[PDB]
Ligand binder design. Sequence first.
Ligand SMILES: Cc1cc2nc3c(=O)[nH]c(=O)nc-3n(C[C@H](O)[C@H](O)[C@H](O)COP(=O)(O)OP(=O)(O)OC[C@H]3O[C@@H](n4cnc5c(N)ncnc54)[C@H](O)[C@@H]3O)c2cc1C
Ligand SMILES: Cc1cc2nc3c(=O)[nH]c(=O)nc-3n(C[C@H](O)[C@H](O)[C@H](O)COP(=O)(O)OP(=O)(O)OC[C@H]3O[C@@H](n4cnc5c(N)ncnc54)[C@H](O)[C@@H]3O)c2cc1C
Ligand code: SF4
Ligand code: SF4
Ligand code: FES
Ligand SMILES: [Mg+2]
Lengths: 282, 462
Amino acid sequence: MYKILEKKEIAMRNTWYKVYAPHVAKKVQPGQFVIVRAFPNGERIPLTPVMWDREEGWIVLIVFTRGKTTMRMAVELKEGDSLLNVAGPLGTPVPMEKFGKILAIGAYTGIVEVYPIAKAWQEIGNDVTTLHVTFEPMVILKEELEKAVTRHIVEPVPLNPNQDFLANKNVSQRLKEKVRELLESEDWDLVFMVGPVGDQKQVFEVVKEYGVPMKVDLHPIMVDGTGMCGACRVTVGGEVKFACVDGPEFDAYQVDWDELIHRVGFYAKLEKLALEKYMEEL
Amino acid sequence: IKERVPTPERSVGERVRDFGEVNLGYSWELALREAERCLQCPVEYAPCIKGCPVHINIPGFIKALRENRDNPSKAVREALRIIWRDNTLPAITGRVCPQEEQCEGACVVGKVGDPINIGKLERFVADYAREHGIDDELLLEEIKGIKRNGKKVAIIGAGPAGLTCAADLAKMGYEVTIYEALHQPGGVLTYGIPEFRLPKEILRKELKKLSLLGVEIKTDHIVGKTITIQELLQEYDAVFIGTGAGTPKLPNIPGINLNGIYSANEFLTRINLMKAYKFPEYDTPIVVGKKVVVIGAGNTAMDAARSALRLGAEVTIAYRRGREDMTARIEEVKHAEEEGVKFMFFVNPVEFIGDENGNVKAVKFEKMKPGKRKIVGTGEYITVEADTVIIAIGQTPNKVLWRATPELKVDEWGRIVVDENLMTSIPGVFAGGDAIRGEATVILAMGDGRKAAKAIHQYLSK
Ligand SMILES: Cc1cc2nc3c(=O)[nH]c(=O)nc-3n(C[C@H](O)[C@H](O)[C@H](O)COP(=O)(O)OP(=O)(O)OC[C@H]3O[C@@H](n4cnc5c(N)ncnc54)[C@H](O)[C@@H]3O)c2cc1C
Ligand SMILES: Cc1cc2nc3c(=O)[nH]c(=O)nc-3n(C[C@H](O)[C@H](O)[C@H](O)COP(=O)(O)OP(=O)(O)OC[C@H]3O[C@@H](n4cnc5c(N)ncnc54)[C@H](O)[C@@H]3O)c2cc1C
Ligand code: SF4
Ligand code: SF4
Ligand code: FES
Ligand SMILES: [Mg+2]
């Protein structure tokens, strides 16, 4: 249904897709996302339109090669193939308000979701400073995100004799926590963050020690993306809210961090099973 | 005794290992035997007709079979033409209607004996017609005498209300377009009701009729986001809202967000629409524990509990009221009991207990004691262990769905207010099914879709 007009590897485990979807492109707003199904027996996954042309009818999606659905898209999809289903726009658009001096953070491929938001904030007259913390081969959208007040790229090393996370570089979260003290050197009116839930908690614990308001792009599991299943539910201000309807963005001071943290890898076992079986493409 | 003819069914042993249809239904032979039990009550005051929400000529289709015992294909074509005058989903309604509170509940033979099995006789007519290609002959007969009228109609939602509205307008010569939020049409027929109750062949055949009638289905289109009602009004002569009531009611009590706690809508969407039980041949995962507790006792809870046991789990149903208070189909309550679902009555969750890893481990209930009065709690409690909790305490319309069109009148519960001809506060815009009634029945959605197609036609004639 939706033609892959462009497909390229813009970095390590990062693919750029320019999809023809005139329905989404004519109506999408910063903070809004899409639900995609790329295969007949495939699942529905949430992705964010990074850029759009309303006239030409296309959206840009940058998918991080994470598992079965994202890897099968990277390997088996080609410029000229079509995505089966692209549903959207979805979610509540980010408020386009005069906040002032904003620090918009993106951990890993999270900067892809910071880009549409940060750009519109800057255009409406906000003094936006973007920050991208990721592995050195994963640096993406440097030139583009360079159209604001000022950009910083803090890039940890993916050490080969080091495993994936703890005690020390998926603990690239240590430096993101360290550089977050951009507070104490500058005055901020708003902190915004797209990153893994545990990383959002650690950063919020730092920003909280100061009185700076904070917004977070929350990533719970999603199925429909239309408010009819409650998989994406989050306790916001003590109330049960649905991130596909009310979010993805929520006030970081209203979120139950401990709850969302436990809800991170509930499907992990099945997720590694799904990848393992597909990887057997010999 | 002159009791009602029974229907064959697969054994518990075989059916619990798969998702295949449990009740095998009537044969031509058994259908005639059950048809000859009907007393042929006069068409104007026959209580069964009155009891059917859309008033199908029940003795009329029964007598049609009885007079053509000679040729079954003749009898079914005749019985079907009569059913199709008032109902266009007889294979779904005959299987899922709560007859006990409707047609069969009104049947005179029920007062002294068993009432006539109207649902299985209507189902037989439909299934025989579908299998022997009788419905195909009639549909092609309709399509030949169909002339376009230059006029376009948009339909919001592809459930039974929207599917029925589109079919009837196409028959009237309209250029119909359905806007559907999900990747597949059907609504609850595609994500809610399972295969063991409703074989997917009925839905697949219904979408073939609409593809033959020329109706176009626009999937991945969320009205209110993708496009608005105002925008639709600028392109279409008329609109019909059939968006249902799919938002799940979730209690805001301690533990609602522990791992293992699903809403029934999610749990059934993953099975019905996503085929997660076939993981990894299908990519959508599903986690089912050793012990499942289902909260509620409606059809949704029966479907969820019965689906969970087919995944090897031991299931328990926990209900707020008693055995007689259950809203699920009495036939499906029987099926869940034979299949091995345990029933716990007069219990109300007050907390979902979990471990330090945030997984559900137990459910804590308040013992309740026995219409707009409701019940009350005894102050006494009971705790049961659970690895998976499925919430099925109802669904509601998306109370914030209509905020993109404020000129559309909506009430306190999220239901679209309509006039006697099902027209909304906006002329040119009609609405039916769960969007106006809240959570209701397939027959009530079918009928509203049928009624609104007559009103759209009349409103588009002057
Ligand atoms: C609102 C939102 C916007 C997003 N935008 C982007 C984007 O612009 N670019 C991008 O690369 N990624 C984005 N993601 C993440 C992306 O949806 C998931 O990484 C992807 O669906 C996982 O598919 P997979 O099978 O390849 O990985 P899996 O093996 O399924 O899981 C990988 C990880 O992703 C998470 N995940 C799995 N399934 C889902 C799901 N259906 N919804 C959300 N998270 C899931 C799990 O926590 C898991 O740890 C977004 C997620 C959300 C919720
Ligand atoms: C688990 C379960 C069991 C049931 N069992 C029975 C039973 O035994 N007997 C019985 O009579 N009835 C039963 N029902 C009810 C029946 O299935 C119908 O859902 C109901 O009677 C009327 O639904 P509807 O077609 O009016 O709306 P729905 O069936 O909810 O149709 C809504 C459809 O429109 C689409 N949509 C919704 N909102 C939007 C939007 N904003 N924009 C675009 N598209 C949208 C969705 O994709 C959805 O599929 C059951 C329902 C459920 C969920
Ligand atoms: S009421 Fe019972 S008997 Fe009288 S017609 Fe309807 S079914 Fe036949
Ligand atoms: S539709 Fe429901 S009620 Fe009307 S006859 Fe068929 S079953 Fe009985
Ligand atoms: S994705 Fe299922 S309701 Fe938000
Ligand atoms: Mg996956």
